Design a protein around this ligand. Structure first.
Ligand SMILES: Cc1cn([C@H]2C[C@H](O)[C@@H](COP(=O)(O)NP(=O)(O)OP(=O)(O)O)O2)c(=O)[nH]c1=O
Ligand SMILES: [Mg+2]
Length: 340
DNA sequence: CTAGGGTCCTAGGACCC
DNA sequence: TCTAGGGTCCTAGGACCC
């Protein structure tokens, strides 16, 4: 009975760079760390996507695929300001807004009577207003539940939208690959595949008890989504639970002196961020993370009442001594868990 | 050749009745 | 606690999203 819109900015980071500097519009560009910083692609424009460049791709791999790729470091304040403006635009239509990141959000427009209650037309006018006021484009999905609205906002990217009507949900589900369902990633998909389950169609012919056994709470979400069942309400009141800061070295470190020097560079950053939402720096836990050169990672965290540099250093020394094992370390991170 | 923000779930032992 | 076991907290790790 509800109407959910999922709105999604196209090539968001890249799109802001291209607006601000038009000479980037028709050449392949990407935001991400450089190859020597051991970077990863955050996102790429469509001329770069043509070459196979994707989010989360190692920058070294992107550059082999697209040698003339232009790498930008990214400008958070620019993306943030675009994001605020966009969210303020959503607020013109409803207060039922659940942001999932800078670039996107769910809207529950069930009880709105903008555009004669048309969720299709509301989505259209939001995309138009965003183009008008920010010169960036958005795609949208309109559906009776969250996850279908989110899948839908991809159907007609870029700068388009897609509507899934209650009567259309069954045909839509029947051939929908499980991997397109939010929270079904590569490991899940492959495990499902090895059971003969590829599509929501397949999952409908499956015993619930049995999915509960092999997958726990995940198996129930699976069975529900496959039916088109998604009762999760649009929640406009979510609050951040943690604050973390980490860096990957251009080169693996092998000595503790190097590790402590990195922590001293991280700590002020963790403190400035935490203070932004907790001026008194009071927290529930603090902890450290190490990532080794074989990519295993370990965290050590404990109840602690107030952000403290020396105890983070101390904690990192124990973690360093105990679980490094002569391995090179590629990443150091600090972490706090916020009070409830 | 593998980022940096995060969220949510699982699970053994401690701890408390 | 009335006794074999139930509930909740602490911690580490993993899958996942953007
Ligand atoms: C998936 C992803 C996104 N991001 C950043 C860059 C994207 O511009 C932004 C929004 O994420 P998205 O909506 O997943 N991707 P997009 O907006 O670039 O592309 P699309 O047009 O939505 O397909 O978040 C990363 O920094 N690393 C990532 O792995
Ligand atoms: Mg997007």
């Amino acid at each position: 009975s509800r109407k959910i819109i999922h709105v999604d900015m196209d090539c968001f980071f890249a799109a802001v760079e291209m607006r601000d500097n038009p000479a980037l519009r028709d050449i392949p560009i990407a935001i991400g760390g450089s190859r020597e910083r051991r970077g990863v692609i955050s996102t790429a424009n469509y001329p770069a996507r043509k070459f196979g460049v994707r989010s989360a791709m190692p920058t070294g791999m992107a550059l082999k695929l697209c040698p003339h790729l232009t790498l930008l470091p990214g400008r958070f304040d620019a993306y943030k300001e675009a994001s605020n403006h966009i969210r303020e635009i959503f607020s013109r239509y409803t207060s039922r807004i659940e942001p999932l990141s800078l670039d996107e959000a769910y809207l529950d427009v069930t009880d709105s009577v903008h555009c004669h209650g048309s969720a299709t037309l509301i989505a259209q006018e939001i995309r138009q207003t965003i183009f008008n006021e920010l010169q960036l484009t958005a795609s949208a999905g309109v559906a009776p539940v969250k996850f279908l609205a989110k899948i839908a906002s991809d159907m007609n990217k870029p700068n388009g939208q897609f509507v899934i009507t209650p009567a259309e949900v069954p045909a839509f589900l029947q051939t929908l690959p499980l991997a397109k369902i939010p929270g079904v990633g590569k490991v899940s998909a492959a495990k499902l595949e090895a059971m003969g389950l590829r599509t929501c169609g397949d999952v409908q012919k499956c015993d619930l008890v049995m999915l509960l056994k092999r997958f726990g709470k995940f198996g129930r979400i699976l069975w529900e989504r496959s039916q088109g069942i998604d009762e999760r309400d649009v929640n406009s009141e979510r609050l951040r639970k943690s604050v973390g800061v980490e860096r990957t070295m251009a080169e693996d470190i092998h000595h503790w002196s190097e590790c402590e020097a990195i922590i001293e560079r991280l700590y002020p950053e963790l403190e400035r961020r935490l203070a932004k939402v907790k001026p008194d720096l009071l927290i529930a836990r603090q902890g450290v993370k190490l990532k080794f050169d074989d990519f295993q990672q370990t965290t050590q965290e404990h109840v602690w009442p107030r952000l403290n540099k020396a105890d983070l250093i101390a904690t990192a020394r124990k973690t360093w001594d105990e679980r490094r094992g002569g391995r090179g370390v590629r990443l150091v991170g600090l972490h706090v868990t916020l009070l409830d």
